[PDB]
Design a protein around this nucleic acid. Structure first.
Ligand SMILES: Nc1ncnc2c1ncn2[C@@H]1O[C@@H]2COP(=O)(O)O[C@H]2[C@H]1O
Ligand SMILES: Nc1ncnc2c1ncn2[C@@H]1O[C@@H]2COP(=O)(O)O[C@H]2[C@H]1O
Lengths: 197, 199
DNA sequence: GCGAAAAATGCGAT
DNA sequence: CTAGATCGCATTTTTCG
DNA sequence: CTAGATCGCATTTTTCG
DNA sequence: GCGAAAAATGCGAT
């Protein structure tokens, strides 16, 4: 619709399965717009480990956190999860775009409000829950949002235990030791591809 | 300027220290703008624990995360830390003050801008750092906000060991038990209040 | 600027 | 193995009439 | 106490030409 | 739409 004026005012780039869409700490002067696919958002800790703050997808503005005050630079890594096509465009341009139309400012603004929410619940989650109850939370959230292939008795996921650990905050060998517990209990199913029965 | 206009249509109220401005859960439909004083945004889980996602001062907007979708709930309690002056409009109303002047829709979104970058880091200090690290990062965090009186060396923050905990996630005990030595380490000294960078 | 009362802290071996 | 979490109510420490 | 973390490497599983 | 190659897993006494 309105978001139609934008799409054809930006570019279409190509990034394969693993390219790092944007890197931490590098003066933000352009916002991406995932056309097809899904990137993942991550910050890391001195010793090297990563944590997956979020999983953006098909139609989510990216790297916006700075279109509002020059002098800023990245705050997280974004590496394409699948095959992603990103709609590139500078901040200034995009800016003079808003003066033409307002509506388009009223879109991501939301996007960045829905995240401010979720993330609060991640702190709500990381501090009010022990790893078990957190893996349960994270499986549901992945049984939700797209890509979760339907299955006979529920939704199906495709994620590595090593990976769960990152969204959550625990170690490789607990995520998987928990999944077995859940497995045994009959809450889900497991095999490199888990089903959240 | 582009705000006196914004306050033009904006019933304004004076809330007293410690008053609940907003309930986490309640149906959301009104915006707010703090023209004086300051609040604190906090979440709390059923067994009774609480957390401080942040403190909000003058110029800050509050309860604006339901402003984009019809039918959200207020995502967290907000309680005046002092006596505030708060202006309100009403969602439906705001949306109109936008079409006619989309600028007032900017300032706000550049706020959340930051708020997201910030609350984001909360998540990262929490899963990455130890209670200590998170106190060291908390002391400085506060040591530089609208209320840090200048001490000959560094400055004088004013806080209780329990606020810290709420901001950190650990206990009333472990905080001090963890503050004593951080003091013996000789970077700061406490006693009812604390001074950052030697005292 | 003095109190009584309301709050905020400290203990530690599990 | 290690970081923190805890509980009953005695104390400093703070608030404001 | 009690929830979680580690490490070196045989197996398994999943990925990529 | 096979297979070597490259990643993810499972173990526990501490
Ligand atoms: N908590 C979050 N939830 C979702 N997306 C985020 C979050 N934090 C950062 N990002 C995204 O990651 C991007 C990294 O670059 P920017 O800081 O430009 O903008 C950031 C956002 O688009
Ligand atoms: N993570 C956060 N950081 C700062 N403020 C927040 C956060 N989460 C919620 N809030 C604020 O608290 C308000 C609670 O109600 P709303 O969701 O309407 O709007 C929310 C924001 O104004």
């Amino acid at each position: 619709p309105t978001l139609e004026w934008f799409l054809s005012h930006c570019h279409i780039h190509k990034y394969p399965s693993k390219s790092t869409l944007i890197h931490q700490g590098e003066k933000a002067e352009t916002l991406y717009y995932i056309v097809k696919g899904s990137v993942a958002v991550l910050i890391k800790d001195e010793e090297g480990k990563e944590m997956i703050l979020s999983y953006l997808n098909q139609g989510d503005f990216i790297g916006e956190l700075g279109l509002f005050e020059e002098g800023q630079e990245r705050s997280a890594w974004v590496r394409a999860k699948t095959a992603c096509e990103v709609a590139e465009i500078s901040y200034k341009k995009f800016r003079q775009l808003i003066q033409v139309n307002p509506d388009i400012l009223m879109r991501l603004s939301a996007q960045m409000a829905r995240r401010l929410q979720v993330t609060s619940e991640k702190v709500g989650n990381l501090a009010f829950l022990d790893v078990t109850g957190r893996i349960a939370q994270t499986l549901l959230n992945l049984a939700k949002q797209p890509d979760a292939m339907t299955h006979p008795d529920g939704m199906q996921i495709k994620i590595t235990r090593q990976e769960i650990g990152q969204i959550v905050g625990c170690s490789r060998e607990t995520v998987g030791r928990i999944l077995k517990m859940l497995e045994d209990q009959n809450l889900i199913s497991a095999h490199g591809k888990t089903i959240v029965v």
